[PDB]
Design an enzyme around this catalytic site. Structure first.
Site, PDB file in Angstrom:
ATOM      1  CD  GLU A 106       1.095 -10.752 -15.563  1.00 32.79           C
ATOM      2  OE1 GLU A 106       0.111  -9.994 -15.308  1.00 32.79           O
ATOM      3  OE2 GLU A 106       1.926 -11.125 -14.696  1.00 32.79           O
ATOM      4  CG  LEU A 122      -1.582  -3.538 -15.602  1.00 34.67           C
ATOM      5  CD1 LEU A 122      -2.191  -4.890 -15.642  1.00 34.67           C
ATOM      6  CD2 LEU A 122      -0.288  -3.603 -14.870  1.00 34.67           C
TER       7      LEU A 122
HETATM    8  N1  NDP Z   1       3.118  -4.062 -14.100  1.00 33.64           N
HETATM    9  C1  NDP Z   1       2.827  -4.357 -12.823  1.00 33.64           C
HETATM   10  O1  NDP Z   1       2.964  -5.473 -12.373  1.00 33.64           O
HETATM   11  C2  NDP Z   1       2.198  -3.251 -11.937  1.00 33.64           C
HETATM   12  C3  NDP Z   1       2.086  -1.973 -12.447  1.00 33.64           C
HETATM   13  N2  NDP Z   1       1.455  -0.968 -11.693  1.00 33.64           N
HETATM   14  C4  NDP Z   1       1.369   0.363 -12.295  1.00 33.64           C
HETATM   15  O2  NDP Z   1       2.178   1.191 -11.417  1.00 33.64           O
HETATM   16  C5  NDP Z   1       1.570   2.519 -11.399  1.00 33.64           C
HETATM   17  C6  NDP Z   1       1.346   2.898  -9.919  1.00 33.64           C
HETATM   18  O3  NDP Z   1       2.644   3.174  -9.305  1.00 33.64           O
HETATM   19  P1  NDP Z   1       2.736   4.438  -8.464  1.00 33.64           P
HETATM   20  O4  NDP Z   1       2.144   5.574  -9.266  1.00 33.64           O
HETATM   21  O5  NDP Z   1       4.055   4.658  -7.757  1.00 33.64           O
HETATM   22  O6  NDP Z   1       1.705   4.286  -7.283  1.00 33.64           O
HETATM   23  P2  NDP Z   1       1.506   3.280  -6.050  1.00 33.64           P
HETATM   24  O7  NDP Z   1       0.506   2.321  -6.548  1.00 33.64           O
HETATM   25  O8  NDP Z   1       2.788   2.891  -5.409  1.00 33.64           O
HETATM   26  O9  NDP Z   1       0.680   4.301  -5.188  1.00 33.64           O
HETATM   27  C7  NDP Z   1       1.466   5.415  -4.626  1.00 33.64           C
HETATM   28  C8  NDP Z   1       0.651   6.034  -3.581  1.00 33.64           C
HETATM   29  O10 NDP Z   1       0.382   4.926  -2.658  1.00 33.64           O
HETATM   30  C9  NDP Z   1       1.004   5.242  -1.397  1.00 33.64           C
HETATM   31  N3  NDP Z   1       2.303   4.636  -1.048  1.00 33.64           N
HETATM   32  C10 NDP Z   1       3.120   3.927  -1.856  1.00 33.64           C
HETATM   33  N4  NDP Z   1       4.177   3.533  -1.169  1.00 33.64           N
HETATM   34  C11 NDP Z   1       4.040   3.993   0.077  1.00 33.64           C
HETATM   35  C12 NDP Z   1       4.823   3.904   1.225  1.00 33.64           C
HETATM   36  N5  NDP Z   1       5.990   3.245   1.182  1.00 33.64           N
HETATM   37  N6  NDP Z   1       4.390   4.481   2.366  1.00 33.64           N
HETATM   38  C13 NDP Z   1       3.232   5.141   2.418  1.00 33.64           C
HETATM   39  N7  NDP Z   1       2.440   5.223   1.339  1.00 33.64           N
HETATM   40  C14 NDP Z   1       2.858   4.707   0.159  1.00 33.64           C
HETATM   41  C15 NDP Z   1       1.080   6.772  -1.391  1.00 33.64           C
HETATM   42  O11 NDP Z   1      -0.266   7.176  -1.200  1.00 33.64           O
HETATM   43  P3  NDP Z   1      -0.801   8.674  -0.655  1.00 33.64           P
HETATM   44  O12 NDP Z   1      -0.578   9.576  -1.842  1.00 33.64           O
HETATM   45  O13 NDP Z   1      -2.190   8.392  -0.144  1.00 33.64           O
HETATM   46  O14 NDP Z   1       0.291   9.079   0.537  1.00 33.64           O
HETATM   47  C16 NDP Z   1       1.529   7.053  -2.796  1.00 33.64           C
HETATM   48  O15 NDP Z   1       1.074   8.336  -3.147  1.00 33.64           O
HETATM   49  C17 NDP Z   1       0.353   2.460 -12.344  1.00 33.64           C
HETATM   50  O16 NDP Z   1       0.845   2.840 -13.652  1.00 33.64           O
HETATM   51  C18 NDP Z   1      -0.007   1.013 -12.297  1.00 33.64           C
HETATM   52  O17 NDP Z   1      -0.768   0.572 -13.434  1.00 33.64           O
HETATM   53  C19 NDP Z   1       0.984  -1.229 -10.385  1.00 33.64           C
HETATM   54  C20 NDP Z   1       1.084  -2.526  -9.911  1.00 33.64           C
HETATM   55  C21 NDP Z   1       1.703  -3.536 -10.651  1.00 33.64           C
HETATM   56  C1  TOP Z   2      -5.788  -7.923 -11.150  1.00 33.72           C
HETATM   57  O1  TOP Z   2      -5.466  -6.952 -12.144  1.00 33.72           O
HETATM   58  C2  TOP Z   2      -4.411  -6.128 -11.948  1.00 33.72           C
HETATM   59  C3  TOP Z   2      -3.269  -6.488 -11.207  1.00 33.72           C
HETATM   60  C4  TOP Z   2      -2.236  -5.568 -11.029  1.00 33.72           C
HETATM   61  C5  TOP Z   2      -1.029  -5.964 -10.267  1.00 33.72           C
HETATM   62  C6  TOP Z   2      -0.136  -6.997 -10.921  1.00 33.72           C
HETATM   63  C7  TOP Z   2      -0.338  -7.760 -12.095  1.00 33.72           C
HETATM   64  N1  TOP Z   2       0.547  -8.694 -12.597  1.00 33.72           N
HETATM   65  C8  TOP Z   2       1.687  -9.052 -11.942  1.00 33.72           C
HETATM   66  N2  TOP Z   2       2.560 -10.027 -12.409  1.00 33.72           N
HETATM   67  N3  TOP Z   2       1.927  -8.265 -10.839  1.00 33.72           N
HETATM   68  C9  TOP Z   2       1.080  -7.366 -10.292  1.00 33.72           C
HETATM   69  N4  TOP Z   2       1.586  -6.742  -9.127  1.00 33.72           N
HETATM   70  C10 TOP Z   2      -2.263  -4.312 -11.597  1.00 33.72           C
HETATM   71  C11 TOP Z   2      -3.388  -3.881 -12.335  1.00 33.72           C
HETATM   72  O2  TOP Z   2      -3.484  -2.638 -12.892  1.00 33.72           O
HETATM   73  C12 TOP Z   2      -2.546  -1.664 -12.434  1.00 33.72           C
HETATM   74  C13 TOP Z   2      -4.494  -4.800 -12.537  1.00 33.72           C
HETATM   75  O3  TOP Z   2      -5.573  -4.400 -13.263  1.00 33.72           O
HETATM   76  C14 TOP Z   2      -6.742  -4.015 -12.551  1.00 33.72           C
END
Ligand code: NDP
Ligand code: TOP
Length: 204
Positions: free
Chosen positions: A30, A23
């Site tokens: 948050e 993040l």
């Molecule tokens: N701000 C927020 O609330 C959040 C932010 N993030 C951020 O998002 C980023 C991660 O996003 P991203 O890189 O797309 O990765 P994901 O976390 O979506 O992981 C992608 C991998 O997970 C699997 N996957 C995802 N969707 C599918 C699907 N529909 N079917 C099958 N497998 C799937 C695949 O794995 P495989 O390669 O094994 O096939 C793909 O390679 C990071 O920067 C993280 O910090 C993440 C969560 C929340």
């Molecule tokens: C519990 O901590 C984390 C949570 C998440 C997911 C996440 C965090 N915040 C909100 N509003 N949505 C989400 N899907 C994402 C994170 O990093 C990618 C975290 O750090 C370990």
């Protein structure tokens, strides 16, 4: 399907979500909000009811090894492989539906542990599949008022005019009702910028 899915995400006003497989900000209230929401199981059902978190593999890899699986939630990691999964417990599925099937198989009426709400918690890629799924009807979005440099974006501009007749922002009162607790109304400032908690829905 039976249960609707809920998506929970923090994003900037330009829809940035990630930077470094992590993040782009350090926001304690948050993460706390995140913990409460994804963990809240209305009181009468608690001994047995658990929420599910459904997060993609890169997101699973982003959680510090100490904090996984995500505590007090059924964790399910989505991956198109089967693979090898570092699970002392850890469910694995190849799609959102394959995960649902695994959860309903595993946590049935005859189960000691029962599912309450299911949350999709990230992965841009997994957030894309959720946004296309028929049972997704709710986004718990934390809006961050800064165009923080990201390398990963939320896949659908759900808060923009183009998607305003599909996606609707709910009163803060309906946010609190749904989450079952009081939630900060309006802008919060932590680490140099404003953010706030919103809830959006789209009719099934
Ligand atoms: N701000 C927020 O609330 C959040 C932010 N993030 C951020 O998002 C980023 C991660 O996003 P991203 O890189 O797309 O990765 P994901 O976390 O979506 O992981 C992608 C991998 O997970 C699997 N996957 C995802 N969707 C599918 C699907 N529909 N079917 C099958 N497998 C799937 C695949 O794995 P495989 O390669 O094994 O096939 C793909 O390679 C990071 O920067 C993280 O910090 C993440 C969560 C929340
Ligand atoms: C519990 O901590 C984390 C949570 C998440 C997911 C996440 C965090 N915040 C909100 N509003 N949505 C989400 N899907 C994402 C994170 O990093 C990618 C975290 O750090 C370990």
């Amino acid at each position: 399907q039976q249960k609707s899915l809920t998506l929970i995400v923090a994003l900037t006003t330009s829809y940035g979500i990630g930077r470094s497989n992590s993040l782009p900000w350090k926001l304690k209230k948050e993460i706390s909000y995140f913990s409460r929401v994804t963990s809240f199981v209305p009181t009468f059902d608690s001994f047995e009811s658990m929420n599910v978190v459904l997060m993609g593999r890169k997101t699973w890899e982003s959680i510090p090894l100490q904090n996984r699986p995500l505590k007090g939630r059924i964790n399910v990691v989505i991956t198109r492989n089967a693979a090898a999964a570092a699970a002392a417990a850890i469910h694995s599925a190849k799609s959102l539906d394959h995960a649902l099937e695994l959860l309903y198989r595993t946590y049935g009426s005859e189960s000691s542990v029962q599912i309450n709400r299911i949350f999709v918690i990230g992965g841009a890629q997994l957030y894309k599949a959720a946004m296309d799924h028929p049972k997704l009807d709710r986004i718990m979005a934390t809006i961050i008022y800064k165009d923080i440099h990201c390398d990963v974006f939320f896949p659908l501009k759900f808060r923009d005019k183009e998607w305003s007749s599909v996606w609707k922002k709910e009163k803060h009162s309906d946010l609190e009702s749904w989450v079952g607790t009081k939630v900060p109304h309006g802008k919060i400032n932590e680490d140099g910028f404003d953010y706030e908690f919103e809830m959006w829905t789209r009719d099934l």
